[PDB]
């Protein structure tokens, strides 16, 4: 069976401003099959009650999901997204980089 590994982007809904409430996003896309595990991290630890979009897919049949949580960015707090998929031997971690 043909499998496709997820692409991952981590970013904020609005331009990041320390002390200002925002939303932290992890967009996973381009994957097949649809089962996937996605975690948002704060300084290395799992955020609870993260929300996600409804399973859909692109014209090329690959799936995508948006995982999101409200957050207030600060100078010290480090964020990331951790993704597992059948195509991945080990969970992949992508750090939040305000410039990307």
């Amino acid at each position: 069976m043909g499998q496709r590994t997820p692409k991952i982007q981590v970013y904020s809904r609005h331009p990041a401003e320390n002390g200002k409430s925002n939303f932290l996003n992890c967009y996973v896309s381009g994957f097949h099959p649809s089962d996937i595990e996605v975690d948002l991290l704060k300084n290395g630890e799992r955020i609870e009650k993260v929300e996600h979009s409804d399973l859909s897919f692109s014209k090329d049949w690959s799936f995508y999901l948006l995982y999101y949580t409200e957050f207030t960015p600060t100078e010290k707090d480090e964020y990331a997204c951790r993704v597992n998929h059948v195509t991945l031997s080990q969970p992949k971690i992508v750090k939040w980089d305000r410039d990307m």
């Binding site: 982007q9 996003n25 049949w61 948006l66 990307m100």
Partner: protein, 276 residues
Amino acid sequence: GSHSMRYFDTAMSRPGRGEPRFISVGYVDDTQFVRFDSDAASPREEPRAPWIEQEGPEYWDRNTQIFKTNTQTDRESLRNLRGYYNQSEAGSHTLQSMYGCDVGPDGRLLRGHNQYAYDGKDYIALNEDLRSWTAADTAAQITQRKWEAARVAEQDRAYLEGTCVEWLRRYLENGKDTLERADPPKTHVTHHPISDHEATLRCWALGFYPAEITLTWQRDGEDQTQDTELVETRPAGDRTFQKWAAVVVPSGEEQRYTCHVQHEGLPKPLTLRWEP
């Protein structure tokens, strides 16, 4: 001024964990307006646009009953396809479909769509004529035979030319304030030194709707396609989308580079440069 309606359906078997999950999500352009999920704990929750809620209980009851029928049909289809491919009962398989219509500014049909994929591979599709099928392999040829025998294309054509176009019109009218509004990108260019001799120029587009956008870098007015890093357009979570394009440029040569932005919400295309 043109618009589309599309449903994205996914049926996914899960041996040992119940009957296959079926989900059908409806979109007008890049706006999800309904979702039906066989795993829904409460149909009172299956989210829907405000302009769908105004359609009343008759609409919802009718669509819920179509969804239930579609769930059964695609579950049985998964069973049949497993047989056509001589596959065991042990593995999970995925049957996807997309169907719907594209219309112009006048609301007239441009074309219809109804196609399917099995385990991520194209399986069968209704041709643009809305009368004939393209089957990918000898398994899909069986589906084609069954569907030709039952005159399915004629029913699909009636939906695509009639129902789909008529409801897309209704939805565009009821949801006009959002559906017919294009929000232009907010743009800026950032500069990130990489080393003493190179820097990254990143051209940003934020807050735009619909998702379609063109974002390019030029050097001395020549497209930099090969040298541009272009991320996938990504949802912000508030209906809008984001994208960026970046190029690595020699220090001091920044002014030779221009970022070009095209989008439906812009009065005119943008040309942007790094502004130190």
